[PDB]
Design a protein around this motif. Structure first.
Motif, PDB file in Angstrom:
ATOM      1  N   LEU A 142       0.820  -1.199   0.000  1.00  0.00           N
ATOM      2  CA  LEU A 142       0.000   0.000   0.000  1.00  0.00           C
ATOM      3  C   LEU A 142       0.860   1.258   0.000  1.00  0.00           C
ATOM      4  CD1 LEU A 142      -3.122   1.029   0.724  1.00  0.00           C
ATOM      5  CD2 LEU A 142      -2.575  -1.219  -0.193  1.00  0.00           C
ATOM      6  N   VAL A 143       1.902   1.283   0.821  1.00  0.00           N
ATOM      7  CA  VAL A 143       2.806   2.429   0.883  1.00  0.00           C
ATOM      8  C   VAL A 143       3.583   2.613  -0.416  1.00  0.00           C
ATOM      9  CG1 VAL A 143       4.745   3.512   2.030  1.00  0.00           C
ATOM     10  CG2 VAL A 143       2.989   2.386   3.379  1.00  0.00           C
ATOM     11  N   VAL A 144       4.012   1.509  -1.013  1.00  0.00           N
ATOM     12  CA  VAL A 144       4.735   1.530  -2.281  1.00  0.00           C
ATOM     13  C   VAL A 144       3.842   2.088  -3.391  1.00  0.00           C
ATOM     14  CG1 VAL A 144       5.728   0.080  -4.098  1.00  0.00           C
ATOM     15  CG2 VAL A 144       6.521  -0.115  -1.738  1.00  0.00           C
ATOM     16  N   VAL A 145       2.581   1.897  -3.311  1.00  0.00           N
ATOM     17  CA  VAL A 145       1.679   2.449  -4.305  1.00  0.00           C
ATOM     18  C   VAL A 145       1.856   3.956  -4.193  1.00  0.00           C
ATOM     19  CG1 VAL A 145      -0.719   2.943  -4.868  1.00  0.00           C
ATOM     20  CG2 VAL A 145      -0.011   0.612  -4.461  1.00  0.00           C
ATOM     21  N   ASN A 146       2.092   4.423  -2.971  1.00  0.00           N
ATOM     22  CA  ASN A 146       2.284   5.844  -2.708  1.00  0.00           C
ATOM     23  C   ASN A 146       3.509   6.409  -3.419  1.00  0.00           C
ATOM     24  OD1 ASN A 146       0.116   5.443  -0.826  1.00  0.00           O
ATOM     25  ND2 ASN A 146       0.893   7.183   0.362  1.00  0.00           N
ATOM     26  N   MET A 147       4.604   5.655  -3.428  1.00  0.00           N
ATOM     27  CA  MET A 147       5.812   6.120  -4.098  1.00  0.00           C
ATOM     28  C   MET A 147       5.493   6.249  -5.577  1.00  0.00           C
ATOM     29  SD  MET A 147       9.667   5.183  -4.869  1.00  0.00           S
ATOM     30  CE  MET A 147       9.873   6.571  -5.972  1.00  0.00           C
ATOM     31  N   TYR A 148       4.756   5.283  -6.095  1.00  0.00           N
ATOM     32  CA  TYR A 148       4.397   5.284  -7.492  1.00  0.00           C
ATOM     33  C   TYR A 148       3.593   6.547  -7.735  1.00  0.00           C
ATOM     34  CZ  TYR A 148       1.308   3.726 -11.408  1.00  0.00           C
ATOM     35  OH  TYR A 148       0.570   3.640 -12.570  1.00  0.00           O
ATOM     36  N   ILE A 149       2.674   6.870  -6.838  1.00  0.00           N
ATOM     37  CA  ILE A 149       1.868   8.082  -6.978  1.00  0.00           C
ATOM     38  C   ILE A 149       2.633   9.399  -6.845  1.00  0.00           C
ATOM     39  CG2 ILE A 149      -0.265   9.222  -6.348  1.00  0.00           C
ATOM     40  CD1 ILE A 149      -0.324   6.301  -7.505  1.00  0.00           C
ATOM     41  N   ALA A 150       3.538   9.483  -5.879  1.00  0.00           N
ATOM     42  CA  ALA A 150       4.321  10.699  -5.671  1.00  0.00           C
ATOM     43  C   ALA A 150       5.255  11.007  -6.831  1.00  0.00           C
ATOM     44  CB  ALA A 150       5.102  10.620  -4.369  1.00  0.00           C
ATOM     45  N   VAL A 151       5.908   9.978  -7.357  1.00  0.00           N
ATOM     46  CA  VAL A 151       6.827  10.148  -8.474  1.00  0.00           C
ATOM     47  C   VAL A 151       6.117  10.609  -9.739  1.00  0.00           C
ATOM     48  CG1 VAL A 151       8.460   9.009 -10.017  1.00  0.00           C
ATOM     49  CG2 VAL A 151       8.521   8.531  -7.581  1.00  0.00           C
ATOM     50  N   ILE A 152       4.949  10.040 -10.008  1.00  0.00           N
ATOM     51  CA  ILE A 152       4.188  10.401 -11.193  1.00  0.00           C
ATOM     52  C   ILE A 152       3.721  11.848 -11.194  1.00  0.00           C
ATOM     53  CG2 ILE A 152       2.358   9.710 -12.756  1.00  0.00           C
ATOM     54  CD1 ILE A 152       4.676   7.709 -12.009  1.00  0.00           C
ATOM     55  N   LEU A 153       3.255  12.326 -10.052  1.00  0.00           N
ATOM     56  CA  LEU A 153       2.780  13.697  -9.952  1.00  0.00           C
ATOM     57  C   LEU A 153       3.879  14.697 -10.262  1.00  0.00           C
ATOM     58  CD1 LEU A 153       0.949  15.373  -6.949  1.00  0.00           C
ATOM     59  CD2 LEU A 153       2.025  16.426  -8.947  1.00  0.00           C
ATOM     60  N   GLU A 154       5.031  14.528  -9.629  1.00  0.00           N
ATOM     61  CA  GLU A 154       6.160  15.421  -9.845  1.00  0.00           C
ATOM     62  C   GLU A 154       6.667  15.344 -11.270  1.00  0.00           C
ATOM     63  OE1 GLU A 154       6.466  17.161  -7.365  1.00  0.00           O
ATOM     64  OE2 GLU A 154       6.054  15.993  -5.556  1.00  0.00           O
ATOM     65  N   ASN A 155       6.713  14.134 -11.810  1.00  0.00           N
ATOM     66  CA  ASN A 155       7.205  13.928 -13.161  1.00  0.00           C
ATOM     67  C   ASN A 155       6.359  14.654 -14.194  1.00  0.00           C
ATOM     68  OD1 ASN A 155       7.853  12.987 -15.710  1.00  0.00           O
ATOM     69  ND2 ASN A 155       7.222  10.879 -15.304  1.00  0.00           N
ATOM     70  N   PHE A 156       5.046  14.606 -14.042  1.00  0.00           N
ATOM     71  CA  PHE A 156       4.185  15.294 -14.985  1.00  0.00           C
ATOM     72  C   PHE A 156       4.439  16.792 -14.919  1.00  0.00           C
ATOM     73  CE2 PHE A 156       0.522  12.303 -16.203  1.00  0.00           C
ATOM     74  CZ  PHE A 156       1.397  11.239 -16.277  1.00  0.00           C
TER      75      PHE A 156
END
Ligand SMILES: *[C@@H]1O[C@H](CO)[C@@H](O[C@@H]2O[C@H](CO)[C@@H](O)[C@H](O)[C@H]2NC(C)=O)[C@H](O)[C@H]1NC(C)=O
Ligand SMILES: *[C@@H]1O[C@H](CO)[C@@H](O[C@@H]2O[C@H](CO)[C@@H](O)[C@H](O)[C@H]2NC(C)=O)[C@H](O)[C@H]1NC(C)=O
Ligand SMILES: NC(=O)OC[C@@H]1N=C(N)N2CCC(O)(O)[C@@]23N=C(N)N[C@@H]13
Ligand SMILES: *[C@@H]1O[C@H](CO)[C@@H](O)[C@H](O)[C@H]1NC(C)=O
Ligand SMILES: *[C@@H]1O[C@H](CO)[C@@H](O)[C@H](O)[C@H]1NC(C)=O
Ligand SMILES: *[C@@H]1O[C@H](CO)[C@@H](O)[C@H](O)[C@H]1NC(C)=O
Ligand SMILES: *[C@@H]1O[C@H](CO)[C@@H](O)[C@H](O)[C@H]1NC(C)=O
Ligand SMILES: *[C@@H]1O[C@H](CO)[C@@H](O)[C@H](O)[C@H]1NC(C)=O
Ligand SMILES: *[C@@H]1O[C@H](CO)[C@@H](O)[C@H](O)[C@H]1NC(C)=O
Ligand SMILES: *[C@@H]1O[C@H](CO)[C@@H](O)[C@H](O)[C@H]1NC(C)=O
Lengths: 173, 120, 1140
Positions: free
Chosen positions: C1121-1135
């Motif tokens: 569940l927390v790792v899903v968060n890393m996936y989410i945080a990285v994507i937002l900044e990247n865009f």
């Protein structure tokens, strides 16, 4: 699993005492056959007279009177690969005081290698009439109370100062 | 299956030297104790086989009377090579030459067959 | 005239169909793997159809004009290649038929041209790859830097082995090595851990180790894994790191190096896995996903008797009764599935029959409603609805079962979906499956075509080798479980690689087929195959998605709680209180003094917390205090501690609970969550998404249940086998065919055991566990071997009897893991999107202070020009400035650094002195030139030089570089300690980092990583705390378990340092299956309940099956569940960065 712990150094007179000698193999998986010898030299005298030998399953005890009777094996049982060798004495006496040296002999069976090793664990114990509470236990208990008292004094101390100020504020308005 | 390369027919002039060349190919690396090579001769198709050279730890030349001392090993087996040399070939050397190679750990046994014909 | 006829022939409805039909048929033929001789004629015909199809296009288009029309199109080039090749082969040909034949597989590629719209999809895929150019450069550079660090730090380490101390006949380590080369011969000489393929890895330091007494540690021989796993050369190090990045069996590399290297180096892996793998992979997803949106959206934007029957018939329609009768049936369906869920390997005879009676009633009711259903609306009306047809097929199957493959019978359970119409989320899962074969059917089809080409290509190239070689790969002399000999088998290997399981199989191919060939094929399958899979997942997901003195006192206490010293003081106690937890463990008996203070220390803590809580009540009052979620957590924790303390003082302790209660202490670090601002923000986000997560979980559970029920019928009770206890090898079945036979052997034989798997399909609950392992790909293969091997309930399993049961696992993975994960990811990220929208479009992963800082970093993005600088008046000063300013000069420096980097790569294990000396000297020149450049910029630039941020990094690197060389030299003169020296050299890698300055594309990506550090840190802190609570629970609970698989000296729960190492490993859920297994066994002969454990009070080494399962499973889910968060945080900044 196996852990090495040093034996207690003070034995109350007229009470049973257990001496701990624990030797752990470097690798748990390996299988070897062990046997032990304990030799004790009484205080005020030089040298060591072997007191007991434990090989196979039976325990062999020397005929000397100082330890005649009063000794029972508390070691690993039925393993044939002892690992832990300990001696328990019933009816501890002054005569049982001095330096204890315990040597271990181990036959390790490898694929085509047979290894014989020796490790020496020596235990020194002094008999005392009354059990003496450890210094660490006493210092900590006294030390703990001071903290409990100091913190409370600090907590009460703030309230007298803080509370008075609060009371003062209501009157001004 | 061991891979064997030999000429099915080898035509050699009487009196010349005849190299009997065969290629054996199999996976792994050859082992001296492990690698065994056998060579046999037959005067004709249905004729009894006569072993004349073996590799067992080393080359063993059986010195068959029918060849005198004209047989030599001519191959480095580590190279998958097991060729033999028949010096100063004579008309009676005509026939069938068989190479059998069994190589551990390969279970399969290779077999090369050469029909040697002697010109005039 | 002829041209008209040919042209007439060229464009026709039938011709496209005719060309295509032959091609599909051709594919079936490739699958033969030793086609009969008669099939050769058929081969000729295929050649004939292509030339004819090929000839007409060329005849009509060309007009004997050079085939201008014909060769202009790129695809046609492919057809020409195929025709010549078929023709070329008859003509004199190249020596390798297999290598040459492989081309024929090219015909399969023709299929792409024939099918309508396929051409468009392939083009769409290529466009995505172009966007990936910058990420590829960074990935190679990143992998490269780590490879250099890894090589310097660990070179030659994998070599260590325990060499025995005493050798007979004056033999020497050197003498022994050349003479012997056999596993049996080798075993006598080096340690070898009871049947492992290679010698035990040993270590020099106290932390790593250890070799049994009588064996000493020396480094010699090949690296483990056939020599494939080593850090000796840059190429080898690169392969090792690439494996870490994709996380394929990464746990072993980690375990192996730590053992040889020592535990302190665990830090290297944490940084590499955390930055190199989690981060790099995420970048690829963002770019692929980001790229897909532009093209998907850009394309989308452009577009925009007879009389009696009627009386009876009318009545039946009234009987539809949608309000109740239709609804009533669904309750019946749910009940039916529940009925089916009850099964076990051992079932009493009466119970078995009851299930049979119960099934008939349900079968009858479903049919009666169907027969009854037909009368009311008529047959044509009845079959109009799709669900009806769907329902009809299932009912018909049941009727046939009674008289006329019993597995199909197990199939009625699907009926369970019917509930999909009512449920909003289930409807969504149904929608997702449809899209794959619906709108996205063309894209999905490409995946099928690519998998097919690779399976066949692999089969042609390596099929022969596996059979002949066998031995290099297998001790036995028989084919291994995973091999490329047959199409089904070749296909299985390709499917495995889609999941990230490429390395284990590759070592096998390499032994038999050689390094160059095996590496090229596997690398291509992984890169090309994964890109398609990634596209389908992302494409599918996005498309789917869219007096009263009392009052004064009360006021004052409020003052105390609010005050900063108090808040600050309380936090210190929490960290301190938590820390005391780490000390307890197996080694606590030793160091008796620390034990005494810690025991006393806790009492002071208990008093402080109880005291603090009372202040809370007076300051807040009961109503305010209990309406707070945090306080309840806080109030609850003090209570458990309080109960133990009162019970403990009293005595009357150790009687289960309260004793079980003591273990509950591990919860103490939990109060820390409220105090830290960063930790709390992350927790708020998760709470926001639990309700949403709950809905998806229900669908997953219902969906998985059908697979689990299906699995239970097929394999329940069939996993038992008779095994030789000494080596755990199943008996042949030639002897001991059935369980009854196995028992007779035991009576006359000492070590033969009839035993179950431990994770299997015996009951529905267990099936869920078996499914979980398959879903995560960890421990999945042991289960599959069991499934295929299985024959009957009380019969010994034959080797690969079922063979086609593999299909069951393949279907589950596609539906169970690929689709649900698609659903799981889709809902969670979307829910996160809604949360962001609610709080004024502000990032939800940062504390308020962090937000101010994040904005400052945003400012660095701007390119406003800085002042140029003025050349000093002096010409001598000016020319240098003039020279330095020139861009051409800078390019030269960039080239120089690249030259420097190549020098580092040349270093390898056991290079020799002449080689070593030259490298040292070349290095010095590099330091002088670089130092030289720095001085030159300084002479011309002056104060201006210090203004630029990059110049400062460049200046700092030079200072580190000179010092690193000198210190190493001083160290050499002083001597003593090699290890400090390797770390010191790590300074040179600093110059390589300057390359980043040159590349504009890589820098943007790097900037994005920097932007997300604040968000990542909060998650990291939260993740660390959870890991910490678990480590404590683990130390008390799992120390003393028997050491089996995944648990051995090191990587065990015996101490806190050790527990932490394991928990980090399982965070990626790698090897989770292994650790869990020792915990599962309970009772003889799996383990001894009462074991002595010298030096300690505790008895027995039995895992708690119930407690163990909850612990590992809960951790796997929470970390995910927390790792899903890393996936989410990285994507937002990247865009955001790319968008700018
Ligand atoms: C189970 O496997 C063991 C391990 O190989 C077998 O034990 C071997 O038996 C042969 C002949 O009895 C001995 O020569 C070997 O020395 C044994 N191996 C060792 C190292 O003990 C055993 O035969 C198998 N059990 C049965 C009942 O067949
Ligand atoms: C289980 O396997 C055993 C072993 O074959 C079967 O019992 C018999 O095995 C003996 C050898 O000791 C043969 O002489 C018999 O022919 C076998 N039975 C028969 C009726 O032929 C047994 O039938 C198998 N099935 C069970 C016991 O359920
Ligand atoms: N046997 C199995 O589950 O196959 C999958 C793969 N292969 C192994 N030999 N492993 C060692 C342990 C393990 O977890 O099973 C695993 N480690 C990872 N990373 N995946 C697993
Ligand atoms: C104690 O020691 C004395 C002298 O050392 C000896 O005479 C006496 O027998 C000992 N006690 C016992 C019980 O043997
Ligand atoms: C040590 O010996 C005493 C003597 O009675 C025995 O009761 C005790 O159990 C032994 N130690 C162990 C193994 O508990
Ligand atoms: C200790 O020894 C005395 C003899 O002096 C004996 O009477 C007594 O029973 C012994 N102690 C115990 C606990 O048996
Ligand atoms: C080694 O074993 C032999 C048996 O041959 C024994 O005599 C010897 O005492 C052992 N070595 C040691 C140090 O005990
Ligand atoms: C030796 O040659 C004979 C031919 O008669 C063959 O059958 C045999 O296998 C050979 N020996 C070995 C060890 O291969
Ligand atoms: C060393 O090897 C030689 C063989 O040349 C042998 O004669 C000698 O005994 C060996 N040394 C020892 C100490 O055994
Ligand atoms: C071993 O088989 C024998 C038959 O000779 C039987 O008497 C014995 O009971 C069997 N062993 C067990 C443990 O049943």
């Amino acid at each position: 699993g196996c852990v090495e712990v040093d034996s207690e150094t003070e034995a109350v007179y007229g009470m049973t005492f257990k001496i701990l000698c624990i030797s752990c193999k470097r690798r748990s998986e390996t299988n070897a056959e062990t046997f032990t010898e304990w030799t004790f030299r009484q205080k005020g005298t030089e040298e060591f007279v072997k007191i007991l030998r434990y090989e196979n399953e039976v325990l062999q005890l020397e005929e000397d009177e100082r330890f005649e009777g009063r000794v029972v094996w508390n070691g690993s049982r039925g393993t044939k690969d002892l690992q832990d060798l300990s001696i328990f004495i019933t009816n501890v006496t002054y005569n049982h005081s001095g330096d204890y040296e315990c040597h271990v002999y181990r036959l390790l069976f490898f694929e085509n290698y047979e290894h014989n090793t020796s490790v020496v664990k020596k235990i020194h114990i002094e008999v005392v009439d009354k059990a003496n509470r450890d210094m660490a236990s006493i210092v900590s208990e006294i030390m703990m109370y001071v903290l409990i008292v100091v913190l409370t004094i600090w907590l009460v101390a703030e309230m007298i100062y803080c509370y008075k100020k609060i009371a003062a504020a209501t009157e001004t308005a | 299956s061991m891979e064997v390369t030999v000429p099915a027919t080898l035509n050699v002039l009487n009196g010349s030297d005849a190299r009997l060349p065969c290629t054996f190919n199999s996976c792994y690396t050859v082992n001296h104790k492990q690698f065994s090579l056998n060579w046999t001769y037959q005067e004709c198709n249905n004729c009894s086989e006569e072993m004349f050279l073996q590799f067992r730890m080393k080359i063993i030349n059986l010195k068959l009377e029918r060849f005198q001392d004209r047989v030599e090993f001519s191959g480095n087996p580590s190279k998958y090579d097991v060729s033999v040399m028949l010096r100063n070939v004579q008309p009676e050397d005509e026939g069938i030459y068989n190479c059998y190679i069994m190589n551990p750990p390969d279970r399969h046994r290779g077999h090369g067959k050469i029909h040697l014909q002697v010109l005039m | 005239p002829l041209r008209r006829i040919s042209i007439k022939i060229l464009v026709h409805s039938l011709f496209s169909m005719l060309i295509m039909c032959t091609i599909l048929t051709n594919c079936i033929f490739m699958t033969m793997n030793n086609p009969p001789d008669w099939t050769k004629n058929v081969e000729y015909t295929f050649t004939g159809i292509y030339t004819f199809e090929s000839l007409v296009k060329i005849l009509a288009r060309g007009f004997c004009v050079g085939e201008f029309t014909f060769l202009r199109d790129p695809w046609n080039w492919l057809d020409f290649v195929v025709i010549v090749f078929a023709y070329l082969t008859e003509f004199v040909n190249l020596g390798n038929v297999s290598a040459l034949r492989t081309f024929r597989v090219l015909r399969a590629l023709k299929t792409i041209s024939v099918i309508p719209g396929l051409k468009t999809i392939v083009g769409a895929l290529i466009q995505s790859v172009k966007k990936l150019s910058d990420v590829m450069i960074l990935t190679v550079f990143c992998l490269s830097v780590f490879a250099l660090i890894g090589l310097q730090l660990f070179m030659g380490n994998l070599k260590h082995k325990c060499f025995r101390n005493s050798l007979e006949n004056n033999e020497t380590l050197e003498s022994i090595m050349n003479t012997l080369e056999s596993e049996e011969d080798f075993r006598k000489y080096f340690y070898y851990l009871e049947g492992s393929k290679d010698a035990l890895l040993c270590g020099f330091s106290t932390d790593s180790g250890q070799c049994p007494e009588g064996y000493t540690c020396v480094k010699i021989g090949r690296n483990p894994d056939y020599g494939y796993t080593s850090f000796d050369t840059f190429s080898w190090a690169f392969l090792a790191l690439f494996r870490l990045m994709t996380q394929d069996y990464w746990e072993n590399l980690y375990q192996q190096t730590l053992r040889a290297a020592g535990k302190t180096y665990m830090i290297f892996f944490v940084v590499v896995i955390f930055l190199g793998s989690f981060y790099l992979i995420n970048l690829i997803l963002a770019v692929v996903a980001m790229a897909y949106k532009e093209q998907n959206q850009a394309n989308i934007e452009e577009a925009k008797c007879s009389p009696y029957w009627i009386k009876f018939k009318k009545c039946i329609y009234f009987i539809v009764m949608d309000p109740f009768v239709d609804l009533a049936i669904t309750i019946c369906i749910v009940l039916n599935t529940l009925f089916m869920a009850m099964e076990h390997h051992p079932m009493t005879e009466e119970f078995k029959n009851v299930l049979a009676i119960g099934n008939l009633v349900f079968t009858g009711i479903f049919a009666a409603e169907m027969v009854l259903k037909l009368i009311a609306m008529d047959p044509y009306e009845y079959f109009q609805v799709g669900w009806n047809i769907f329902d009809s097929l299932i009912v018909t199957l049941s009727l046939v079962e009674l008289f006329l493959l019993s597995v199909l019978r197990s199939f009625r359970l699907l009926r369970v979906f019917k509930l999909a119409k009512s449920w909003p989320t289930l409807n969504m899962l149904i929608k997702i499956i449809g899209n794959s074969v619906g709108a996205l059917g063309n894209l999905t089809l490409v995946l099928a075509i690519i998998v097919f080409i690779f399976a066949v290509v692999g089969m042609q190239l390596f099929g022969k080798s596996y059979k002949e070689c066998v031995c290099k790969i297998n001790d036995d002399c028989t084919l291994p479980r995973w091999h490329m000999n047959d199409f089904f088998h070749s296909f299985l290997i390709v499917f495995r690689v889609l999941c990230g399981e490429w390395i284990e199989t590759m070592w096998d191919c390499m032994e038999v087929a050689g390094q160059a060939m095996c590496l090229i094929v596997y690398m291509m399958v992984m890169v090309i195959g994964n890109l398609v899979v990634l596209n389908l997942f992302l494409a599918l997901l996005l498309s789917s998605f869219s007096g009263k003195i009392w009052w004064n006192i009360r006021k004052t206490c409020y003052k105390i709680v609010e005050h900063s010293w108090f808040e600050s003081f309380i936090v210190l106690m929490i960290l301190l209180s938590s820390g005391a937890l780490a000390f307890e463990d197996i080694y606590i008996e030793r160091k008796k003094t620390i034990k005494i203070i810690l025991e006393y220390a806790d009492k002071i803590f208990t008093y402080i917390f109880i005291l603090e809580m009372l202040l809370k009540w007076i300051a807040y009052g009961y109503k305010t205090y209990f309406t707070n979620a945090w306080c309840w957590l806080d109030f609850l924790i003090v209570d458990v501690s309080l109960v133990t303390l009162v019970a403990n003082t009293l005595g009357y302790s150790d009687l289960g609970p309260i004793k079980s209660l003591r273990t509950l202490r591990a919860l103490r670090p939990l109060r820390a969550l409220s105090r830290f601002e960063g930790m709390r923000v992350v927790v708020n986000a998760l709470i926001g998404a639990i309700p949403s997560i709950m809905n998806v979980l229900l669908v997953c559970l219902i969906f998985w249940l059908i697979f689990s029920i299906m699995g239970v019928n097929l394999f329940a009770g069939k996993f038992y086998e008779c095994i030789n206890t000494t080596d755990g090898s199943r008996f042949p079945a030639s002897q001991v065919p059935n369980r009854s036979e196995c028992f007779a052997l035991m009576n006359v034989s000492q070590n033969v055991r009839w035993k179950n798997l431990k994770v299997n399909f015996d009951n529905v609950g267990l099936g869920y566990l078996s499914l979980l392992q398959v879903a995560t790909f960890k421990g999945w293969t042991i289960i599959m071997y069991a499934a295929v091997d299985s024959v009957n309930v009380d019969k010994q399993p034959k080797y690969e009897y079922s063979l086609y049961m593999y299909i069951y696992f393949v279907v589950f993975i596609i539906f169970g893991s690929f689709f649900t994960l698609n659903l799981f990811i889709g809902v969670i990220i979307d829910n996160f999107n809604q949360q962001k929208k609610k709080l004024g479009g502000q990032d939800i992963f940062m504390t308020e202070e962090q937000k101010k800082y994040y904005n400052a970093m945003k400012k660095l993005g701007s390119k406003k020009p800085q002042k140029p600088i003025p050349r000093p008046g002096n010409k001598i000063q000016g020319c240098i400035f003039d020279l330095v300013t020139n861009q051409a000069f800078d390019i030269s420096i960039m080239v120089l650094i690249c030259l420097n980097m190549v020098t580092m790569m040349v270093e390898k294990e056991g290079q020799s002195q002449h080689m070593t000396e030259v490298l040292y000297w070349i290095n010095v020149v590099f330091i002088i030139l670089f130092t030289g450049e720095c001085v030159l910029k300084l002479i011309s630039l002056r104060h201006y030089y210090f203004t630029v941020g990059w110049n400062i990094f460049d200046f700092v690197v030079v200072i580190i570089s000179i010092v690193g060389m000198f210190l190493a030299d001083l160290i050499e003169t002083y001597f003593v300690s090699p290890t400090l020296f390797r770390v010191i050299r790590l300074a040179r890698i600093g110059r390589i980092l300057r390359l980043v300055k040159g590349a504009k594309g890589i820098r943007t990506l790097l900037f994005a990583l920097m932007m997300s550090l604040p968000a990542l840190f909060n998650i990291g802190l939260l993740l660390f705390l959870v890991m910490f609570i678990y480590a404590i629970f683990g130390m008390s609970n799992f120390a003393y378990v028997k050491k089996e698989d995944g648990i051995n000296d090191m990587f065990n729960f015996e101490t806190f340092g050790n527990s932490m190492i394991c928990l980090f490993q399982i965070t990626t859920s790698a090897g989770w299956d292994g650790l869990l297994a020792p915990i599962l066994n309970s009772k003889p002969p799996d383990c001894d309940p009462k074991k002595v454990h010298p030096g300690s009070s505790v008895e027995g080494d039995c895992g708690n099956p119930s407690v163990g399962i909850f612990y590992f499973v809960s951790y796997i889910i929470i970390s995910f569940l927390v790792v899903v968060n890393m996936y989410i945080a990285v994507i937002l900044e990247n865009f955001s960065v790319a968008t700018e």
